[PDB]
Design an enzyme around this catalytic site. Structure first.
Site, mmCIF file in Angstrom:
data_model
loop_
_atom_site.group_PDB
_atom_site.id
_atom_site.type_symbol
_atom_site.label_atom_id
_atom_site.label_comp_id
_atom_site.label_asym_id
_atom_site.label_seq_id
_atom_site.Cartn_x
_atom_site.Cartn_y
_atom_site.Cartn_z
ATOM 1 N N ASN A 106 -36.917 -14.796 54.018
ATOM 2 C CA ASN A 106 -37.732 -15.743 54.564
ATOM 3 C C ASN A 106 -37.010 -16.135 56.043
ATOM 4 O O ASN A 106 -37.540 -16.524 57.023
ATOM 5 C CB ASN A 106 -37.950 -16.941 53.889
ATOM 6 C CG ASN A 106 -39.059 -16.742 52.764
ATOM 7 O OD1 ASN A 106 -39.769 -15.637 52.921
ATOM 8 N ND2 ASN A 106 -39.060 -17.609 51.855
ATOM 9 N N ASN A 131 -47.052 -15.316 55.934
ATOM 10 C CA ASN A 131 -47.701 -14.470 54.946
ATOM 11 C C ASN A 131 -48.862 -13.771 55.799
ATOM 12 O O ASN A 131 -49.129 -12.761 55.332
ATOM 13 C CB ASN A 131 -48.398 -15.573 54.174
ATOM 14 C CG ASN A 131 -47.660 -16.323 53.287
ATOM 15 O OD1 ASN A 131 -46.262 -15.957 53.084
ATOM 16 N ND2 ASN A 131 -48.156 -17.525 52.558
ATOM 17 N N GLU A 138 -46.824 10.359 49.088
ATOM 18 C CA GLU A 138 -45.802 11.036 50.067
ATOM 19 C C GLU A 138 -44.468 9.846 50.611
ATOM 20 O O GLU A 138 -43.697 10.324 50.939
ATOM 21 C CB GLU A 138 -46.566 11.278 51.699
ATOM 22 C CG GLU A 138 -47.669 12.378 51.466
ATOM 23 C CD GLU A 138 -47.032 13.353 51.295
ATOM 24 O OE1 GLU A 138 -45.914 13.672 51.774
ATOM 25 O OE2 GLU A 138 -47.821 14.404 50.683
HETATM 26 N N1 GTP Z 1 -42.703 -16.244 52.565
HETATM 27 C C1 GTP Z 1 -42.933 -16.939 51.715
HETATM 28 N N2 GTP Z 1 -41.994 -17.520 50.843
HETATM 29 C C2 GTP Z 1 -42.188 -18.766 49.855
HETATM 30 C C3 GTP Z 1 -43.508 -18.990 49.589
HETATM 31 N N3 GTP Z 1 -43.408 -19.766 48.870
HETATM 32 C C4 GTP Z 1 -42.188 -20.080 48.226
HETATM 33 N N4 GTP Z 1 -41.494 -19.260 48.988
HETATM 34 C C5 GTP Z 1 -39.948 -18.862 48.744
HETATM 35 O O1 GTP Z 1 -39.509 -18.479 47.544
HETATM 36 C C6 GTP Z 1 -38.590 -19.214 46.721
HETATM 37 C C7 GTP Z 1 -39.234 -20.212 45.647
HETATM 38 O O2 GTP Z 1 -39.922 -19.471 44.949
HETATM 39 P P1 GTP Z 1 -41.191 -20.044 44.081
HETATM 40 O O3 GTP Z 1 -42.284 -19.011 44.097
HETATM 41 O O4 GTP Z 1 -41.567 -21.313 44.394
HETATM 42 O O5 GTP Z 1 -40.987 -20.061 42.691
HETATM 43 P P2 GTP Z 1 -41.988 -19.752 41.341
HETATM 44 O O6 GTP Z 1 -42.550 -18.428 41.318
HETATM 45 O O7 GTP Z 1 -43.145 -20.835 41.750
HETATM 46 O O8 GTP Z 1 -41.072 -20.208 40.093
HETATM 47 P P3 GTP Z 1 -41.320 -21.598 39.346
HETATM 48 O O9 GTP Z 1 -40.860 -22.820 40.277
HETATM 49 O O10 GTP Z 1 -40.961 -21.717 38.060
HETATM 50 O O11 GTP Z 1 -42.930 -21.931 39.115
HETATM 51 C C8 GTP Z 1 -38.116 -20.025 47.876
HETATM 52 O O12 GTP Z 1 -37.065 -19.234 48.568
HETATM 53 C C9 GTP Z 1 -38.991 -20.150 48.854
HETATM 54 O O13 GTP Z 1 -38.808 -20.306 50.110
HETATM 55 C C10 GTP Z 1 -44.390 -18.381 50.704
HETATM 56 O O14 GTP Z 1 -45.707 -18.842 50.359
HETATM 57 N N5 GTP Z 1 -44.300 -17.584 51.441
#
Ligand code: GTP
Ligand code: GDP
Ligand code: MG
Lengths: 238, 430, 226, 442
Positions: free
Chosen positions: D205, D227, D253
Site C-alpha cells: 500500500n 483499488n 504463457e
Molecule cells: N489496498 C488496500 N489495502 C487495504 C484495504 N483494506 C485494508 N487494507 C490493508 O490490509 C491490512 C488490513 O487487513 P484487513 O483486510 O483489514 O484484515 P482482515 O482480512 O479484515 O482480517 P480481520 O481483521 O480478522 O477481519 C492493512 O495493511 C490495511 O492497510 C483496501 O481496501 N485496499
C-alpha cells in the site's frame, strides 16, 4: 520410418541394397571421425531449489571412402615464386622497415650500422642490382646506393632472369580487363600469396535491423538505434 | 500433378492465408470461388492447387490445424476464408503454451489421427500426387511439435513422395519467447532426419528486406507473409505453366542435394524495389540476376561470403532469351569463383518459364545450398548451452515426461550437422 | 519411442520405396453356435437327495434298480417330468438313475403315457439346448424309445416339432469321411448324425399323415422316407 | 477463456468492488445486469464470456464469490448500487472476525465457513467449459485474510488439482503499518503461499500511495484510488484473453515464461502510464517511453528496488494501438541499459504480448484517457530484501514472546513460529543461490 526398414521393404536387388547401406555406413563413419565440439553437460555443484518441487506442481505433474585426385596437366603454367614464399603479409613491409631504421637514425642524430643477415634472396637481389648498375653506368655502385634493394620488390622471370615488379597487384581477387572482363585469383604481378579478405555481415551495416525514421531540416532521413552495434576496430599502425 | 499444403499454428495460418491470396490472384479465382480469368492458360492447370466443386466452384486442397481456436476466427475472417472446406479444419480446445512436449505428446497424439485421416483423404483423391508443402515456425510450440509429428507420420505413409518445408526460426535479436532455444533445437533434430529439403527463414531478414529494399514506413507481419507467399508460389511456377525448359521439385532436389544430410537451403526472390525508385530502373535478366545473388535480398542472417555454395538453382518466369540466362549463370560462376566448391564443375541449374506473374514482365526465384547455414545453428546451440547448463526451465519438459537424453541426442545431431557443413566451408591446403 | 540420429530417410526419396470399407479387415468376432453352454441346476437332484423317489440302487453283482411299488400303479403325471429332467445331469449316480428310470417307466407305462405328453416338452427342449454330446445322445435314445412306447404317442408330438427340431439341424450333416476305412463307433452308437437321421425317420413313420410337412418346415435338407 | 475471482476479507472485497465496477463499465453491462438496446455491441458477441454468464433472458451475472467473516462489508455491498447484479448466494458472510489471529481464522472460525465456500465455488465451476484459473485477492496482514486464505488455497489445491491459482496479495508495508501483529501473520502466511500458489504478485500500500502522490496529483488519496489502480492492472492482464491482437498471450504463457524453477514464483508488478490528465497532455506517450517507464523503480507497485538484484524473466503486455517495431526497439533499448542486469543463464529474457483494445477509463480523476498502455510482471532476486524487513520485525517481537499466548490459546503450537521463520529463511537462501553466477567451469 527407419532407413533399414525402408530398404527391406523396397524393391531393389541385393547388390544395390548392400551398396546403399554401405554408402550410408561410410558416410556415418566419416561424420563420426570429423572432430568438432562435444555435447554439453550440467555442472557438478548445483544449488538447492533446482530439484525440490512445490506441492501444487506435484499435483500438476503427470508422473577411405573419399578419394584424393590431383590430375596434373603437362605444360601447366608456373603458379609459385621463390621470392613470394619468403614474405609474410602480417609483418610490416620492407619499405616500412627502412623507414623505421631511418626514423631511429634521425632520433639518435647519428648513423646506425644496418643489420647483417645471410638470406639468399638478399644476395641474389644485390648481385642483379650490381650487374644492372654496372651496365647502365660504368662504375660499381656505392654502398649507400645499395640501399635501394630493400625498397624494391623482386621476382624471377620464366627464363631465370631477376627483375623488379614495378606495379604489384592486390593479393586478393581482382580484375584484368580487356576486350573481355576476367577475374584472376592469382596473377604473376602479385607480391604476396593469394588469400581471401574477410568481410562484414550484410545485416550489421550502418543502420540496424530496425532503423528509426527521422528527418533532416526539410527532408526525410534515417537514423540508427540500439539495434546497431559498431565494430570494435581496435588496430593501429606500427 | 497436385501439391497438398499443410498450415500449422498462427504464423502458419497467416502465411497460408497470404499464399492462397497470391495463388488465387494468379489463377483469377473470385472470393466466391468463381473462375473469372481471361486466358485458357490459367484454367488448364487449375487442378494443381484447386479441386473442382459442383457447378463451377473450386475448393483449395489444404488442411488447417491448430490447438486453440483463437486463430480460426482470424483465418475465417480473412478475404478467402469462406472458400475453405469445413471438414478440413481440425482444432483442439487449449493452446500449446509454446512447449514442445505439450504440443507433441498430449494434444498432438490426441488430434493427429484426425489430421492424418484428412491428409490421406486429400492425397488419395489426386490422380497423381506431388510432394507436400508445409509452413510453420520452429520456435513456437504447436508449430514445431505437431508439425514435426505430422511430418513423421506422412513420411511413414508416403515415403516415395517429396517432403518440402518452409520454416521460421527465431532471430537472436527479435526475441518473443524465453524458451525458444529448446523448441528450435528439438525441431531441427526432427527435421534433419525427416525432411528431404528444408528452407529456413528468420524474421529479421524479412524486416531488413522491408526497411532497406522496400523502404516501408510501418511494416507489418502481412508484408513478411507476402514475401514468403511470393517465393513459395514462385518455386512451383514451372510445375503449372509451359516453358522453354521445364523444371520440377524432384529435379531441383536431385540437382541441389549432394549428400542426403545437406538438404537445408536458402531462398530469395529478385524484383523487389520501392515505389519511389521503380521509375529509375527497368527489369532485365542481368538486373534480376544481380539482385538475385545480392545478400540484401536474401532471407537469412547468415551471409554467403562466410561460406561456400555447393549448388544453386534459378527459376525464371517470363519471355526471355535462353542465351542471356546461360551466359549470366556462367558469368556469375566465373566472377565469384572462390565462393563455389571446386570439385563440382558447374553449380547452377537454370530453368525458363513462359508465363510471368500478373503485372510483372519477368521474375526469378533463387534456391541456394550454402554452408553458411551452419552459423545460425551454432548461435542457437550457444543459447541452448547457456540455458541447459543451469537447468533454466527444464522442469517444464521433464514434468511433461521428456528424458534429458532427448536433449542430449538433439544437441549431438545438430552439432554433427554443423561439423559436416564446417568441413566443406573451408577449402583444403593442397 | 525416440528418434536416434543418423537413421532417418532424410534427403533419400525414391520411387522404389513404395509401400470404402465400413469395417475392420479382420471381420466380426465369432459367436459359435457349437460352443458349449452352462447346465442349469435340476429338480431331480433335490428330489433324489430329499428322498421322494420310490426306488433304490440294488447292488448285487451289477447295478440295477428296484422299486418298492409296482410300476403300473405310480402317478405318471407327477413322476414322469422329473425323470425327464434328470437327463440333463452329467455326473454319477444321477445319470444312471435317470436313464434307467425313464427306460423302465416307458417300458410298462401302459395307456397313461399319452395324457402326460405336454409335460415332457420342457425337459426335452431344455436338455437339447445344452449342446453337450453325451446328453444329446441320451435324449435321442430316450426319444426313440418314447415314440414306439405306446399307441397314438407320435401323433401327439406333431404340433411340438417347433420346440424339439431346431437342435436337430446342427448335427444332421456331420459324418466323417474316412474313405475305405471301417468305422468302429457303430458298436456303441456313439455317432450323432446317424442317430439324428434315424430319429427323424422314426418320427415321420409314427407321426401320421402330415408329419412330413412339419419336418420339412423345420429341417430344410430333409426329404421323405415314405 | 473463463476465469473465476475469489475475494477474501476487507481489502479483497473492496478491491473486488472496484474491479467489477471496471469490468462492467468496460464491457457495457448495466448495473441491473442488462444491456441497453442502443449500444452497438450486438447480441451475438462473446467477449463478456470471460467474466459473465447469461441465464438466457439476457441478464448478466458475474463469476465471483465474496468471502468475509464480518458482515459489515458484504452488507455494504448488498445495500450499495450493484445490489441486483450479484446473485445473493455468492455473498457469503460469517458472524465475527478472526481478530488479527491467523490461528483463529485457520483453526477456530474459518473451519466452519470453508465448506460453504467450496460448495458455491463448485457450483460456479460446474457452469464452465474452459476455466483456466483462479484469481485471489486478500491481505496477509489481517487474521481472516491470512487464515481463511491459506485454508481455502489448501482445500482448492486438493479438490481442483492442476488448475492454476494466481494471487494478488497486500503484504505488510515496510514502515507504514496498521496493526502490531502484522509480522506474525505475514510469516505464517508465506508458507501457504509458497506451497499453494503458481505465481504470486506482491503489492504494498505504501507504494501505491507513493505512486498516487508522486505521479498523480492527489493530495488526499483513499483506498478507492488504490483499488482502481489494481483493477486497471487486472484488466490489462486479462485483456489478452478477451480481445483480438497481433501477439496473444494465454494465461499459461505467463507461468511458462516467467517461472524458471517451481519455487521461484514471486514476481514484481508495475504499470506504466499512471499519469494525471494535466501531465498526460504535457507529454507524448510513445511505446518506448512507457516501456522505459515500467522499469523505473518509481513505477513499481511493490516496495522493492530491482537494482539490488538480477532479473530472470520479464513478460511485457502491450494493449492498444502499438506496432511490433516499437516493442522490438524498446526491448533492445532495455537490453542495452547498464543498470538493468539479467542472470547469465537467461539470455532470452523477454516475453511480449500485443493487443488492440486500449485501456478503459473509469469516470473520475485517477488516470488520463490514453490510446495505449503496457503492464509488466517480472521475476527478480531483489524480492529477498522485502522479506528481510519482516524477518527483522519478527525477530524483534519474537525475542520477547511479545504476543504468542494469543496464538497458542487459539490452537497453535509454539513450534510453528520457528518452523515458519526457518522456511522463509530458506526462501531467502534460495534467492541467494539462484542469483549466484555459474563459476563452476573455472
Ligand atoms: N489496498 C488496500 N489495502 C487495504 C484495504 N483494506 C485494508 N487494507 C490493508 O490490509 C491490512 C488490513 O487487513 P484487513 O483486510 O483489514 O484484515 P482482515 O482480512 O479484515 O482480517 P480481520 O481483521 O480478522 O477481519 C492493512 O495493511 C490495511 O492497510 C483496501 O481496501 N485496499
Ligand atoms: N513471419 C511471421 N512470423 C510470425 C507470424 N506470427 C508469429 N510470428 C513469429 O513466430 C514466433 C512466434 O511463434 P508462433 O507462430 O507463435 O508459434 P506457435 O504458437 O507454435 O504457432 C515469433 O518470433 C513471432 O514473431 C507471422 O504471421 N509471420
Ligand atoms: Mg476484517
Amino acid at each position: 520410418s527407419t532407413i533399414y526398414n525402408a530398404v527391406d521393404a523396397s524393391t531393389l536387388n541385393d547388390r544395390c541394397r548392400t551398396d546403399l547401406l554401405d554408402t550410408v555406413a561410410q558416410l556415418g563413419r566419416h561424420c563420426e571421425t570429423l572432430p568438432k565440439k562435444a555435447v554439453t553437460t550440467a555442472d557438478a555443484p548445483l544449488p538447492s531449489c533446482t530439484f525440490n518441487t512445490t506441492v501444487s506442481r506435484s499435483q500438476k505433474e503427470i508422473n577411405t571412402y573419399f578419394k584424393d585426385h590431383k590430375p596434373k596437366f603437362h605444360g601447366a603454367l608456373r603458379t609459385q615464386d621463390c621470392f613470394r614464399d619468403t614474405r609474410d603479409i602480417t609483418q610490416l613491409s620492407s619499405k616500412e622497415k627502412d623507414f623505421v631504421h631511418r626514423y631511429a637514425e634521425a632520433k639518435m642524430k647519428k648513423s646506425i650500422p644496418r643489420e647483417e643477415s645471410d638470406d639468399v634472396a638478399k644476395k641474389v637481389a644485390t648481385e642483379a642490382y650490381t650487374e644492372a648498375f654496372r651496365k647502365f653506368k660504368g662504375r660499381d655502385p656505392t654502398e649507400k646506393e645499395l640501399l635501394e634493394v630493400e625498397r624494391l620488390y623482386f621476382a624471377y622471370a620464366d627464363d631465370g632472369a631477376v627483375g623488379v615488379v614495378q606495379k604489384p597487384h592486390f593479393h586478393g581477387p581482382h580484375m584484368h580487363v580487356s576486350i573481355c572482363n576476367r577475374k584472376y585469383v592469382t596473377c604473376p604481378n602479385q607480391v604476396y600469396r593469394a588469400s581471401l579478405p574477410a568481410v562484414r555481415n550484410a545485416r550489421s551495416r550502418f543502420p540496424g535491423p530496425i532503423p528509426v525514421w527521422t528527418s533532416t531540416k526539410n527532408l526525410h532521413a534515417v537514423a540508427s538505434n540500439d539495434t546497431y552495434r559498431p565494430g570494435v576496430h581496435n588496430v593501429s599502425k606500427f | 500433378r497436385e501439391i497438398v499444403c499443410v498450415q500449422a499454428g498462427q504464423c502458419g495460418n497467416q502465411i497460408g492465408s497470404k499464399f492462397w491470396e497470391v495463388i488465387s490472384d494468379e489463377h483469377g479465382v473470385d472470393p466466391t470461388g468463381t473462375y473469372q480469368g481471361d486466358s485458357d492458360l490459367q484454367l488448364e492447370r487449375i487442378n494443381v492447387y484447386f479441386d473442382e466443386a459442383t457447378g463451377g466452384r473450386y475448393v483449395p486442397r489444404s488442411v488447417l490445424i491448430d490447438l486453440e481456436p483463437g486463430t480460426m476466427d482470424s483465418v475465417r475472417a480473412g478475404p478467402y476464408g469462406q472458400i475453405f472446406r469445413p471438414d478440413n479444419f481440425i482444432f483442439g480446445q487449449s493452446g500449446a503454451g509454446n512447449n514442445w512436449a505439450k504440443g507433441h505428446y498430449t494434444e498432438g497424439a490426441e488430434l493427429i489421427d484426425s489430421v492424418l485421416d484428412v491428409c490421406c483423404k486429400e492425397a488419395e483423391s489426386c490422380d497423381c500426387l506431388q510432394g507436400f508443402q508445409i509452413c510453420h515456425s520452429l520456435g513456437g510450440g504447436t508449430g514445431s511439435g505437431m508439425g514435426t509429428l505430422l511430418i513423421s507420420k506422412l513420411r511413414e505413409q508416403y515415403p516415395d513422395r517429396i517432403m518440402m518445408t518452409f520454416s521460421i526460426i527465431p532471430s537472436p535479436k527479435v526475441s518473443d519467447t524465453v524458451v525458444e532455444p529448446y523448441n528450435t533445437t528439438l525441431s531441427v533434430h526432427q527435421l534433419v532426419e525427416n525432411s528431404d529439403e528444408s528452407m529456413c527463414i528468420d524474421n529479421e531478414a524479412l524486416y531488413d528486406i522491408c526497411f532497406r529494399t522496400l523502404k516501408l514506413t510501418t511494416p507489418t507481419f502481412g508484408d513478411l507473409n507476402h514475401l514468403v507467399s511470393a517465393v513459395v508460389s514462385g518455386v512451383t511456377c514451372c510445375l503449372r505453366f509451359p516453358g522453354q525448359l521445364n523444371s520440377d521439385l524432384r529435379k531441383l532436389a536431385v540437382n541441389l542435394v549432394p549428400f542426403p544430410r545437406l538438404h537445408f537451403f536458402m531462398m530469395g526472390f529478385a524484383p523487389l524495389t520501392s515505389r519511389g525508385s521503380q521509375q529509375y530502373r527497368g527489369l532485365s535478366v542481368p538486373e534480376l540476376t544481380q539482385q538475385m545473388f545480392d545478400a540484401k535480398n536474401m532471407m537469412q542472417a547468415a551471409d554467403p561470403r562466410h561460406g561456400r555454395y555447393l549448388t544453386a538453382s534459378a527459376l525464371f518466369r517470363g519471355r526471355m532469351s535462353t542465351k542471356e540466362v546461360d551466359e549470366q549463370m556462367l558469368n556469375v560462376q566465373n566472377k565469384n569463383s572462390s565462393y563455389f566448391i571446386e570439385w563440382i564443375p558447374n553449380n547452377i541449374k537454370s530453368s525458363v518459364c513462359d508465363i510471368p506473374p500478373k503485372g510483372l514482365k519477368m521474375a526469378v526465384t533463387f534456391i541456394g545450398n550454402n554452408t553458411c547455414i551452419q552459423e545460425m545453428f551454432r548461435r542457437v546451440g550457444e543459447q541452448f548451452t547457456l540455458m541447459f547448463r543451469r537447468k533454466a526451465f527444464l522442469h517444464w519438459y521433464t514434468g511433461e515426461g521428456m528424458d534429458e537424453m532427448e536433449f542430449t541426442e538433439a544437441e549431438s545431431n545438430m552439432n554433427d550437422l554443423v561439423s559436416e557443413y564446417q568441413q566443406y566451408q573451408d577449402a583444403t591446403i593442397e | 519411442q525416440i528418434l536416434v540420429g543418423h537413421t532417418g530417410t532424410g534427403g533419400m526419396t525414391f520411387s522404389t520405396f513404395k509401400n470404402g470399407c465400413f469395417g475392420d479387415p479382420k471381420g466380426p468376432e465369432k459367436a459359435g453356435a457349437y460352443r458349449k453352454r452352462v447346465i442349469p441346476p435340476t429338480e431331480f437332484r433335490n428330489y433324489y437327495v430329499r428322498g421322494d423317489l420310490p426306488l433304490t440302487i440294488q447292488q448285487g453283482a451289477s447295478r440295477t434298480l428296484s422299486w418298492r411299488l409296482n410300476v403300473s400303479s405310480l402317478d405318471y403325471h407327477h413322476f414322469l417330468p422329473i425323470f425327464f429332467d434328470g437327463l440333463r445331469e452329467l455326473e454319477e449316480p444321477f445319470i444312471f438313475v435317470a436313464l434307467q428310470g425313464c427306460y423302465d417307466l416307458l417300458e410298462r407305462g401302459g395307456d397313461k403315457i399319452l395324457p402326460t405328453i405336454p409335460q415332457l416338452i420342457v425337459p426335452i427342449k431344455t436338455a437339447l439346448n445344452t449342446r453337450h454330446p453325451t446328453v444329446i445322445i441320451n435324449v435321442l435314445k430316450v426319444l426313440q424309445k418314447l415314440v414306439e412306447s405306446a399307441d397314438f404317442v407320435g401323433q401327439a408330438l406333431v404340433p411340438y416339432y417347433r420346440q424339439i427340431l431346431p437342435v436337430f439341424n446342427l448335427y444332421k450333416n456331420r459324418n466323417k469321411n474316412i474313405g475305405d476305412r471301417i468305422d468302429y463307433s457303430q458298436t456303441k452308437r456313439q455317432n450323432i448324425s446317424d442317430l439324428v437321421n434315424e430319429t427323424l425317420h422314426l418320427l415321420e413313420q409314427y407321426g401320421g399323415e402330415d408329419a412330413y410337412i412339419n419336418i420339412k418346415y423345420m429341417v430344410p435338407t430333409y426329404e421323405s422316407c415314405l | 477463456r473463463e476465469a473465476i475471482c475469489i475475494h477474501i476479507g476487507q481489502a479483497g472485497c473492496q478491491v473486488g468492488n472496484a474491479c467489477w465496477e471496471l469490468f462492467c463499465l468496460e464491457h457495457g453491462i448495466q448495473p441491473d445486469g442488462a444491456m441497453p438496446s442502443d449500444k452497438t455491441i450486438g447480441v451475438e458477441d462473446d467477449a463478456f464470456n470471460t467474466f459473465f454468464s447469461e441465464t438466457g433472458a439476457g441478464k448478466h451475472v458475474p463469476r465471483a464469490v465474496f468471502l468475509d467473516l464480518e458482515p459489515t462489508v458484504v452488507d455494504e455491498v448488498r445495500t450499495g448500487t450493484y445490489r441486483q447484479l450479484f446473485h445473493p448466494e455468492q455473498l457469503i458472510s460469517g458472524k465475527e472476525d478472526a481478530a488479527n489471529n491467523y490461528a483463529r481464522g485457520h483453526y477456530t472460525i474459518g473451519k466452519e465457513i470453508v465448506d460453504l465456500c467450496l460448495d458455491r465455488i463448485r457450483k460456479l465451476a460446474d457452469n464452465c467449459t474452459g476455466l483456466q484459473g483462479f484469481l485471489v485477492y486478500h491481505a496477509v496482514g489481517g487474521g481472516t485474510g491470512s487464515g481463511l486464505g491459506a485454508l481455502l488455497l489448501e482445500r482448492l489445491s486438493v479438490d481442483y488439482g492442476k488448475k492454476s491459482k494466481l494471487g494478488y496479495t497486500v503484504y505488510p508495508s515496510p514502515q507504514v503499518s496498521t496493526a502490531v501483529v502484522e509480522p506474525y501473520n505475514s510469516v505464517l502466511s508465506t508458507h501457504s503461499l509458497l506451497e499453494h500458489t503458481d505465481v504470486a504478485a506482491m503489492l504494498d500500500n505504501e507504494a501505491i500511495y507513493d505512486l498516487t502522490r508522486r505521479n498523480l496529483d492527489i493530495e488526499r488519496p483513499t483506498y478507492t484510488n488504490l483499488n482502481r489502480l489494481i483493477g486497471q492492472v487486472v484488466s490489462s492482464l486479462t485483456a489478452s484473453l478477451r480481445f483480438d491482437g497481433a501477439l496473444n498471450v494465454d494465461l499459461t504463457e505467463f507461468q511458462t515464461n516467467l517461472v524458471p524453477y517451481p519455487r521461484i514464483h514471486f514476481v514484481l508488478t508495475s504499470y506504466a502510464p499512471v499519469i494525471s490528465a494535466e501531465k498526460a497532455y504535457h507529454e507524448q506517450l510513445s511505446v518506448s517511453e512507457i516501456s522505459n517507464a515500467v522499469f523505473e523503480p518509481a513505477s513499481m507497485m511493490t516496495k522493492c528496488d530491482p537494482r539490488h538484484g538480477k532479473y530472470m524473466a520479464c513478460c511485457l503486455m502491450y494493449r492498444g494501438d502499438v506496432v511490433p517495431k516499437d516493442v522490438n526497439a524498446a526491448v533492445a533499448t532495455i537490453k542495452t541499459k547498464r543498470t538493468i542486469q539479467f542472470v547469465d543463464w537467461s539470455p532470452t529474457g523477454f516475453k511480449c504480448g500485443i493487443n488492440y483494445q486500449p485501456p478503459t477509463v473509469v469516470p473520475g480523476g485517477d488516470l488520463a484517457k490514453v490510446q495505449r498502455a503496457v503492464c509488466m510482471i517480472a521475476n527478480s532476486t531483489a524480492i529477498a530484501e522485502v522479506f528481510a524487513r519482516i524477518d527483522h520485525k519478527f525477530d524483534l517481537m519474537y525475542s520477547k514472546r511479545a504476543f504468542v499466548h494469543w496464538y497458542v490459546g487459539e490452537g497453535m503450537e509454539e513450534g510453528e513460529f520457528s518452523e515458519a521463520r526457518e522456511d522463509l529463511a530458506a526462501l531467502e537462501k534460495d534467492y541467494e543461490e539462484v542469483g549466484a553466477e555459474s563459476a563452476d567451469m573455472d
